[PDB]
Write a protein that binds this ligand. Structure first.
Ligand SMILES: COc1cc(-c2cnc(N)c(-c3ccc(C(=O)O)c(C)c3)n2)cc(OC)c1OC
Ligand SMILES: [Cl-]
Ligand SMILES: [Cl-]
Ligand SMILES: [Cl-]
Ligand SMILES: [Cl-]
Length: 244
């Protein structure tokens, strides 16, 4: 459980620095996240430890798996070691789709829907944006922890159905390659969100898919489908789920 056990291959992104690493013992490819607590108080660090201990708990195929936590008092740096998702995040996929003018396959959208819904179902039992949704090597979707496009109508006033809205917005952006509600100001955005109006996703996508995404974007949280009601949907099949 020491930083010297791992070899840094290259930096992925710059919480702090994120790096792709290889464990020397077996050569397993992973990544870690650097948190410089050097400028933190004993209070902030107290929350930092107990928060990462609760990160250690979540073991689920559709949630990014956390393996280890390495402290280095030398540079006062904390390393959270997690699984490597070779496919990157959904943000890049969406960006890649915009540029190349290609819409994502409906099969892919169903995969994200199914696996992110199972991610939420898991998070709710323990009681959301493209850049926090990752893809591994085997078509698996994994969840991982400034205009608020995905903010629900009630989340600007007053709920698990709020997550369904956020998922609704994410899936919509996967289909249309843009968020359901766009605006240059947060007050404009707020305006559009309360009106609850948006375009249909591209017509290459079936009415069935459009229907469910639309239901998730319902203004009444109680009209939105529950995690259960989503998975009962005839669209969602076994091959849309995770596979090792
Ligand atoms: C942001 O862009 C990318 C991210 C990744 C990647 C792979 N595995 C990971 N575990 C993560 C990652 C990094 C940080 C965090 C976080 O807790 O903040 C998470 C949840 C995942 N990212 C891989 C990438 O390679 C394709 C990539 O594209 C350059
Ligand atoms: Cl396009
Ligand atoms: Cl398609
Ligand atoms: Cl309406
Ligand atoms: Cl359209």
């Amino acid at each position: 459980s020491r930083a010297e056990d791992y070899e840094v291959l290259y930096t992925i992104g710059t919480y702090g620095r994120c790096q792709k690493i290889r464990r020397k013992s077996d050569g397993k490819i992973l990544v870690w996240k650097e948190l410089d607590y050097g400028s933190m108080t004993e209070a902030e660090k107290q929350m930092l430890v107990s928060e990462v201990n609760l990160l250690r708990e979540l073991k689920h195929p559709n949630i990014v798996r956390y393996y280890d936590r390495i402290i280095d008092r030398t540079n006062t740096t904390l390393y959270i070691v997690m699984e490597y998702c070779e496919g990157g995040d959904l943000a890049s996929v969406i960006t890649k789709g915009t540029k190349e003018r290609q819409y994502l396959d409906e099969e892919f959208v169903l995969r994200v829907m199914t696996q992110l819904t199972l991610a939420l179902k898991e998070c709710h039992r323990r009681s959301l944006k493209p850049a926090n949704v990752f893809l591994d090597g085997k078509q698996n979707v994994k969840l991982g922890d400034g205009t608020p496009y995905y903010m629900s109508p009630e989340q600007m006033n007053r709920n698990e159905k709020s997550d369904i809205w956020s998922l609704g917005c994410l899936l919509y952006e996967l289909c249309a390659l843009m968020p359901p509600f766009t605006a240059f100001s947060q007050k404009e955005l707020a305006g559009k969100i309360r009106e609850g109006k948006f375009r249909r996703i591209p017509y290459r996508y079936s009415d069935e898919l459009n229907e469910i995404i639309t239901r998730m974007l319902n203004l009444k949280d109680y009209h939105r489908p529950s995690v259960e009601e989503i998975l009962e949907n005839p669209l969602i099949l076994e091959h849309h789920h995770h596979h090792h």
